[PDB]
Design a protein around this ligand. Structure first.
Ligand code: SF4
Lengths: 274, 325, 611, 527
């Protein structure tokens, strides 16, 4: 273990980005109960005011505080990102593993089915199902829908990983000394592939947030009175040209979240890959 | 060459012929178009419900419904919208508007990205590499709908500062060109700058990272050292021997690059107000329209698969290990 | 004026730690027509010294000193000026042919460009004729047809032949050959030596050849320099060196070379330990941690290469004690072949008329079969108790697949396999798994065969744990096995990446030995190890045979090791066993043409027999 | 920027001499939907923008001044006159020179044919409004070739409203056969008689162009052509910053500051009689069919904060509209809102008494949750009303669900059919306020899209129209209005502030308020 954390902790940018990402995630939940105004509380005396002594980040056209709104947007949009990345990596792991294990016709049917699923861009397929996930309170169905169409390219990397390792030599030596197959699995493959499945999760977080916020921007994702960073940017853009903060603050927060996720991904990959 | 290409053409035909089927089933399960009718207040008399169900085919089971749809689509009749307009009248113009955006975006984008990535890999860890890799990270981290609006705000401020409308960004063409053809083309170019730049940045930021990885892998091979040992200069070796070899991996990724640009064009067409296929997708999903969306998934699959066959031709032409054995 | 003169050349690379000083101030000279050899094991700095003279080191390398070619100094020149000497005056041959040629140009084109870039007036339609003529001169068959081939249509031998031609193009004044015959079989290697000799004859050039073995040096070279720890430590004519090496290091490096003139059971003379890390050396002689004659006087200041005999120099201060003495004497090793015990005439493995085929099919997306590669062709072979069988052949000869088919212990397509009186066809899983306790295998790659993230105790214990022995006892077993193979108790916690290559192969041997088997399958165990380390492992294998009564299947491409280990030999050609019998008969009196040729191709480290 | 947003007695156009104006050019103007039908007397084509095109193209009987006063249009008619009050009858007179674009003389038959169509006497014409053509006992010719005499069996003080104000005269060709009326004008209008006529249509780029009528017998216009383009909300102000949009209205503070800060644009202000509202579907099958629920919901919507949000920075002290028939600044205005004054606690008591118990976040009866579907045109100005209403209804426990829909076919495909539970849109009136009563609020009214009413309202309406003294007629109209409030028919929200942004070179064009444009006079100021 010690060597990988030593490699990562020397990567100052990556450790800094991971720190910032965790502090954002914690703040999105820990901070709101301390603020003077919540989301869904409207001050009709202070419509479209700039930042000041009572509205830390000003208000939007409805009189909503913009700080509280963005904390709520971060909540929803970062929770969906994490959950989608985890589930997507899980599906990718299982499909890739079974294909790269069996080889032969079963692999050539599972990789051809993945190739078929990639035929029409994923965003289109997600947006076709979205009328059914719209207008329900539980985010579960949106998370399931985003994960079910995100695992496909990761399946290919996992297929490689497995196919290469299935013919590595330490794996060979094992069979020649009486180790049972379950002992091979809990003993060798899990310790050796887990480190790269974690890279899959780290890289999928950014794509998951991108997908959710784009879908929300078009009006297909999260529905008012709930909010997402995509919802906030879509609401603010029609005002940005006259009053800029209502678009620049949510947008800068979203771009910062994505930059931190990508820095963490690349740095962690460079920490594992020699 | 013309064995590998033939065998992979048959594969793409089968992929499209099943993509259309499965996304028509997905569309026909996800959408319930008669909901508006069935929720009208003086509840529509059944005759209307049955009549409109028939006119849209909702009275047939999925398999027969799709058989009928293809039976007409292969004849060029893509059916009617939920409001009763034919789909075929829009489709040609929409495809034109969309392809003119995608082509310029992808051509300029991938060429720029390849050059930037090769330069970074050649000058690894020098200042120019540091700057270009972080800029690529930024451009890859901003969502398309943020980039488009940032550029629009920027143009607005330019116009105000310079004192004249320097950039135009609404629609594809202005009302009138006052005769002449040279201008009839010029105005369209002016309109096309910002929409296509929005896509070119995304493409360049992706392909620079991919090309940097591929070129760094090529610099790990011995044949660069062999080439220089013959008397070539460092830069002629890098270009003629390294960069041509590094280009081969890029030919395989272009299909997925185009799949990304097809997604970006939805946002670009909406934000800049271009009447193409991407805007039609949003309209069709919003109104629960099966036929609009069926036409659009066939287009979006076909454009991605033709990217694949062009990439297949280029990968055979570049690499001899598929030409001869 | 000397063709090449190097003075006080030094090279250092930079890393996250201290800069590793790969070359530490060497000097030498090369004359027209002369062949100079630089000899040394891995980590010795030879390759850096080559690429410094050619000027193709990685950009993270610093270079100092002087390099003069025909009187003009080469260090510090811009590439626009250096590339007027590369190719036109210095021609170079590189180590690994698998990557040496660019994959998207035909080989005739790649040679034609070589002549074109210094003779720009010549015109493509003349350069291509010269390219075909060079492919002819280098001995590639059907040269005008193969001139159209792309590199992936060539074998390793053909690929290396094509690099020799890109180099003798023009007529380089100096030839620099960077380990040119590693990763090549012995027959191809003999042919490459012929080609290089012929190239020297036609150009008249001098040759600087860099090798890690003494066989090529005894055969090809005229002078030799021995590199150790980044400096030249002895130099002489090859006759003088072989017969009169005055330096403890060369005493060893020349006693650890296996020999066909030795009999089975002869122990080699190894050199203990491993080479120093060239980042931050200790004071005094670098060989002091391994020197068997080391005295504290040699730790006060690093010795200098000094004159000892006519044209002979050595960098040791105690050389008077080395004169005339054998390596066995100086290292106090009893090399004699000890009396073999009377093992019983019973047979522990027998293979009768075994056959297997690999299909040859064309097409990537869909496959069409167009022929059959008969990888194993009716082989009959057997192993007596307590003895070694040596299976030898070149790449693609099917020796390896034969071994690994035997170890899978399953019914073959035709023929039949017997192990300890049991036939693999009457063997259900309850019996097959119990039979695995009796034979295990040692693999050629210590990087791949050991789990990267499992400590040595866990690795050596794994057969014992999986076979169900208890935690109380397996600890004792591991502690004893580490002693048996000569590692220290205190290495169990260390992870595999922290060891040397020799140590990792000793771990593999311990792991295979874990159940006390009666047969061990040795799949190229000692290839790609330094020769002084190979000698130690060969001694270990022999000693374990006498200690425990083991039996070995030994499979290798080289024959020099096999003469020491093998009681019986079977030689394989393209899946067929074509000679078989006692080792002294097979190696003393071959009667098959292929076998006689294969034995003739083996490089011999004695230069006196150059008739 | 700030003023009161009530109907005044002035206008805001660059009044200039047409002769001094530039002798050519074109005027570019926006649309939100390419017209689905061009017969403005038919519900499909009775839209404010379709009419806004028609202004330059069809005749009118009277001209409306900046205070709402009337005068005869001597360019089309010589002398319209009220010949006798008691068996009420009036005479129209078309000018001795007057012709349609096809060559036909404009004749008493055209008055009669239009009157017959919009009489409502035959259901085959699916008219947008019956107006008073249902009050004309008969229509006949007089002594002269073109003299037209119209007799009313029943009184009608809005008799100036026929063929004037927001109303017009159509050729008999397109109003005599039901077939011609309903289906004769789906693609371009029929004959025309205005100073301009439509001469190019483009369903491909979504544009329409008018050009001067070469047969025109009035004043020679100071423009050659008028060009209409179809755009969405975000295409109206950014394209206004470009030479694309010549003029466009201003709906939010964002739009006002953009139009103020850009160069070559001026803000023009004259409040018109148009207003904006929620309308409730009280027809069989709609969850709001029960008037008790409609009143309970109405008490839970705070219209004052809706006004203050929606008109922020566009009005000095913004207030809601509290009257249906007359808007603020018209004579006879009054406040009749009391019955549904915002009081969410009594609304909670009412929803309890109606059995919609609190369960979860929202309320339920018989396991059915109380969700209201809200239908509106998707624009930044319209979303604010929806979001405030949704927020204040969530507090009382009613889910209100937003259905934002684009402009194409909005009325035809959703409003006309009745595909809503609550709908947002606005009414654009004119100087004849009682003309709206039988159109909208009567239980059989043509524009009663919610199908709400009862005999008391119809009786009071008739009683209001059956009188010849405005002083008392207005009081009766306010009684009608109070009954409309007591029903829970619809909720007026705001009155249009009249802010329009125009290109500073334009003259005799801008915000007219009550006034009509003189379509011969518009032009561009010489550089
Ligand atoms: S100088 Fe001394 S320490 Fe060095 S090799 Fe010679 S005897 Fe050994």
């Amino acid at each position: 273990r010690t060597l990988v954390v030593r490699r990562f902790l020397r990567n100052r940018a990556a450790v800094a980005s991971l720190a910032a990402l965790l502090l954002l995630f914690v703040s999105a939940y820990a901070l709101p109960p301390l603020l003077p105004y919540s989301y869904d509380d409207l001050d009709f005396n202070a419509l479209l005011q700039p930042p000041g002594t009572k509205h830390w980040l000003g208000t939007n056209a409805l009189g909503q505080d913009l700080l509280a709104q963005t904390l709520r947007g971060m909540q929803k949009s970062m929770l969906i990102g994490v959950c989608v990345a985890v589930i997507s990596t899980g599906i990718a792991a299982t499909v890739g593993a079974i294909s790269g294990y069996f080889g032969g016709w079963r692999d050539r049917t599972l990789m051809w089915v993945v190739d078929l699923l990639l035929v029409v861009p994923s965003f289109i397929l997600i947006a076709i199902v979205t009328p059914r996930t719209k207008n329900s309170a539980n985010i579960m169905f949106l998370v399931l829908l985003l994960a079910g169409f995100g695992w496909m390219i990761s399946s290919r990397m996992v297929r490689g990983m497995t196919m290469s390792l299935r013919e590595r030599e330490f794996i060979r030596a094992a069979r020649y000394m009486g180790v049972s197959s379950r002992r091979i699995i809990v003993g060798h493959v899990v310790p050796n592939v887990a480190s790269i499945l974690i890279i899959d999760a780290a890289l999928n977080v950014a794509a998951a947030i991108l997908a959710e916020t784009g879908l929300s921007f078009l009006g297909f994702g999260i529905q008012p009175p709930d909010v997402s960073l995509g919802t906030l940017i879509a609401d603010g853009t029609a005002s940005a040209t006259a009053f800029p903060w209502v678009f620049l603050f949510p947008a800068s927060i979203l771009v910062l979240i994505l930059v931190c996720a990508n820095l963490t991904g690349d740095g962690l990959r460079d920490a594992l890959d020699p | 060459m013309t064995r590998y290409l033939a065998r992979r053409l048959l594969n793409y035909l089968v992929l499209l012929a099943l993509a259309s089927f499965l996304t028509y089933c997905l569309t026909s399960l996800a959408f319930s178009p008669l909901e508006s009718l069935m929720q009208r207040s003086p509840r529509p008399p059944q005759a209307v419900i049955d009549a409109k169900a028939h006119d849209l085919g909702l009275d047939r089971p999925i398999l027969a419904r799709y058989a009928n749809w293809v039976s007409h689509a292969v004849r060029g009749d893509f059916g009617t919208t939920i409001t009763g307009q034919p789909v075929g009248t829009e489709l040609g113009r929409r495809i034109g508007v969309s392809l003119r955006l995608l082509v310029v975006g992808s051509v300029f984008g991938t060429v720029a990205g390849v050059v930037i990535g090769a330069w970074g890999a050649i000058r690894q860890y020098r200042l120019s590499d540091r700057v270009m890799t972080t800029l690529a990270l930024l451009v890859l981290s901003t969502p398309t709908f943020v980039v488009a609006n940032l550029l629009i705000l920027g143009a607005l401020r330019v116009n105000w500062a310079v004192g004249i409308q320097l950039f135009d960004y609404t629609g594809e063409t202005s009302p009138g060109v006052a005769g002449g053809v040279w201008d009839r083309l010029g105005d369209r170019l002016q309109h096309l700058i910002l929409p296509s730049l929005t896509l070119a940045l995304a493409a360049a930021a992706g392909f620079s990272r991919y090309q940097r990885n591929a070129m760094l892998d090529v610099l790990g091979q011995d044949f660069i050292r062999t080439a220089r040992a013959k008397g070539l200069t460092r830069r002629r070796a890098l270009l003629k021997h390294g960069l041509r070899t590094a280009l081969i991996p890029m030919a395989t990724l272009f299909a997925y690059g185009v799949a990304g640009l097809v997604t970006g064009a939805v946002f670009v067409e909406k934000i800049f107000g271009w009447h193409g296929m991407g805007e039609w997708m949003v309209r069709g999903i919003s109104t629960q329209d099966t036929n609009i969306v069926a036409a659009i998934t066939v287009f979006s699959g076909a454009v991605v698969l033709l990217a694949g066959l062009l990439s297949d031709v280029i990968y055979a032409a570049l690499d001899p290990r598929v030409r001869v054995s | 004026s000397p063709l090449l003169e190097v003075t006080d050349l030094a090279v250092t690379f930079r890393t996250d730690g201290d800069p590793v000083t790969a070359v530490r101030g060497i000097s030498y000279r090369v004359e027209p027509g002369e062949v100079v050899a630089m000899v040394g094991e891995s980590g010795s700095g030879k390759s850096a010294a080559a690429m410094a003279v050619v000027g193709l080191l990685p950009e993270y390398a610093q270079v100092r000193g002087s390099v003069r070619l025909q009187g003009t100094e080469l260090l510090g020149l811009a590439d626009n000026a250096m590339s007027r000497f590369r190719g036109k005056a210095i021609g170079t041959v590189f180590q690994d042919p698998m990557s040496a040629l660019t994959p998207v140009y035909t080989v005739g084109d790649q040679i034609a460009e070589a002549i074109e870039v210094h003779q720009p007036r010549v015109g493509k339609k003349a350069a291509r004729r010269r390219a075909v003529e060079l492919l002819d001169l280098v001995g590639i068959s059907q040269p005008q047809r193969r001139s159209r081939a792309f590199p992936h249509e060539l074998s390793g031998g053909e690929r290396q032949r094509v690099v020799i031609a890109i180099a003798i193009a023009n007529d380089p004044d100096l030839l620099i050959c960077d380990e040119p015959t590693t990763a090549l079989d012995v027959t191809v290697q003999a042919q490459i030596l012929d080609v290089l000799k012929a190239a020297r004859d036609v150009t008249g050039a001098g040759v600087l050849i860099i090798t890690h073995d003494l066989g090529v040096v005894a055969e090809f070279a005229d002078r030799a320099l021995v590199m150790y720890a980044g400096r030249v430590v002895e130099s002489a004519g090859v006759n003088d060196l072989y017969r009169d090496r005055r330096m403890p290091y060369t005493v060893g490096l020349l006693g650890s070379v296996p020999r066909l003139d030795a009999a089975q059971g002869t122990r080699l003379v190894p050199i203990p330990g491993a080479p120093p890390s060239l980042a931050g050396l200790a004071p005094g002689c670098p060989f002091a941690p391994r020197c068997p004659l080391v005295i504290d006087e040699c730790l006060t200041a690093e010795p200098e290469l000094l004159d000892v005999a006519t044209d002979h120099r050595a960098a040791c201060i105690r050389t008077e004690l080395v004169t005339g003495r054998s390596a066995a004497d100086i290292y106090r090793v009893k090399t004699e072949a000890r009396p073999a015990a009377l093992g019983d005439a019973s047979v522990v493995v027998r293979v009768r008329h075994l056959v297997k085929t690999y299909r040859l099919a064309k097409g990537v997306v869909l496959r069409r079969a167009i022929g059959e590669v008969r990888a194993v062709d009716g082989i009959s072979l057997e192993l007596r108790q307590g003895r070694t069988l040596g299976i030898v052949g070149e790449s693609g000869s099917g020796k390896s697949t034969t071994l690994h088919e035997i170890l899978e212990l399953a019914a073959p397509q035709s023929g039949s396999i017997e192990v300890l009186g049991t036939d693999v066809a009457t063997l259900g899983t309850a019996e097959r798994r119990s039979l695995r306790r009796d034979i295990q295998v040692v693999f050629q790659d210590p990087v791949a065969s050991l789990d990267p993230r499992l400590p040595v105790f866990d690795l050596i214990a794994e057969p014992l744990q999986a076979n169900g022995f208890g935690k109380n006892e397996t600890h004792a077993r591991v502690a004893e096995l580490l002693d048996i193979v000569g590692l220290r108790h205190g290495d169990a916690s260390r992870y595999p990446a922290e060891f040397s290559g020799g140590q990792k192969q000793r771990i593999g041997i311990a792991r295979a030995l874990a159940l006390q088997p009666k047969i061990l399958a040795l799949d190229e165990p000692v290839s790609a190890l330094d020769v002084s380390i190979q000698a130690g492992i060969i001694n270990l294998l022999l000693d374990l045979q006498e200690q425990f009564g083991l039996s070995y299947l030994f499979v290798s491409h080289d024959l020099s090791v096999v003469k020491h280990l093998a009681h019986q030999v079977a030689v394989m050609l393209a899946g067929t066993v074509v000679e078989q019998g006692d080792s002294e008969e097979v190696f003393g009196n071959p009667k098959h043409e292929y076998t006689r040729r294969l034995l003739g191709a083996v490089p011999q480290p004695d230069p006196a027999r150059r008739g | 920027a700030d003023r009161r947003a009530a109907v005044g007695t002035t206008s805001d156009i660059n009044q200039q001499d047409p002769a001094t104006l530039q002798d050519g050019g074109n005027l570019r103007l926006s649309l939100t939907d390419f017209p689905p039908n061009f017969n403005i007397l038919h519900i499909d084509g009775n839209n404010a923008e379709v009419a806004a095109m028609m202004k330059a193209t069809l005749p009118r009987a009277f001209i409306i001044g900046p205070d709402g006063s009337t005068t005869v249009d001597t360019n089309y008619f010589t002398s319209i006159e009220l010949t006798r009050t008691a068996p009420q009858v009036v005479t129209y007179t078309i000018n001795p020179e007057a012709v349609w674009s096809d060559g036909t003389p404009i004749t008493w038959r055209d008055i009669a044919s239009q009157i017959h169509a919009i009489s409502g006497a035959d259901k085959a014409f699916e008219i947008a409004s019956s107006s008073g053509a249902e009050r004309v006992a008969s229509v006949t010719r007089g002594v002269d070739d073109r003299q037209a005499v119209v007799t009313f069996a029943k009184p009608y003080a809005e008799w100036r409203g026929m063929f004037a104000g927001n109303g017009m005269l159509l050729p008999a060709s397109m109003t005599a056969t039901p077939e011609a009326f309903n289906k004769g004008q789906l693609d371009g209008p029929g004959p025309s008689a205005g100073p301009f006529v439509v001469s190019a249509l483009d369903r491909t780029a979504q544009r329409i162009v008018l050009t001067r009528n070469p047969r025109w017998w009035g004043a020679r216009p100071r423009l050659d052509s008028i060009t209409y383009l179809v755009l969405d909300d975000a295409a109206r102000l950014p394209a206004l910053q470009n030479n694309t949009i010549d003029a466009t209205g201003v709906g939010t503070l964002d739009q006002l500051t953009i139009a103020a800060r850009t160069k070559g644009i001026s803000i023009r202000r004259a409040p018109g009689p148009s207003w904006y509202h929620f309308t409730l579907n009280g027809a069989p099958g709609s969850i709001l069919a029960d008037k008790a629920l409609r009143l309970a919901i109405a008490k839970g919507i705070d219209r004052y904060t809706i006004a203050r949000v929606a008109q922020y920075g566009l009005t000095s002290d913004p207030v809601p509209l509290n009257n249906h028939v007359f808007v603020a600044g018209q004579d006879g205005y009054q406040d009749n809102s009391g019955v549904v004054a915002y009081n969410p606690e009594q609304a909670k008591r009412e929803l309890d008494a109606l059995g919609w118990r609190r369960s979860g976040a929202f309320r339920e009866k018989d396991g059915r949750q109380l969700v209201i579907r809200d239908l509106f045109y998707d624009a930044q100005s319209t979303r604010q009303f929806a979001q405030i209403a949704q927020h204040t209804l969530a507090q009382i426990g009613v889910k209100l669900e937003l259905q934002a829909k684009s402009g194409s076919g909005f009325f035809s495909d959703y409003v006309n059919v009745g595909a809503f539970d609550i709908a947002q849109f606005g009414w654009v009136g004119d100087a004849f306020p009682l003309s709206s009563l039988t159109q909208i609020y009567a239980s059989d009214g043509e524009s009663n899209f919610g199908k709400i009413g009862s005999p008391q309202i119809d009786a009071a309406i008739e009683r209001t129209l059956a009188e010849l003294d405005p002083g008392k007629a207005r009081a009766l109209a306010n009684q009608v209005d109070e009954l409309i409030w007591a029903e829970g028919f619809s909720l007026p929200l705001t009155q249009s502030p009249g802010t329009v942004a125009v290109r500073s070179t334009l003259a005799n064009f801008g915000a007219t308020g009550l006034a009509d444009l003189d379509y011969t006079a518009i032009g561009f100021m010489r550089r």
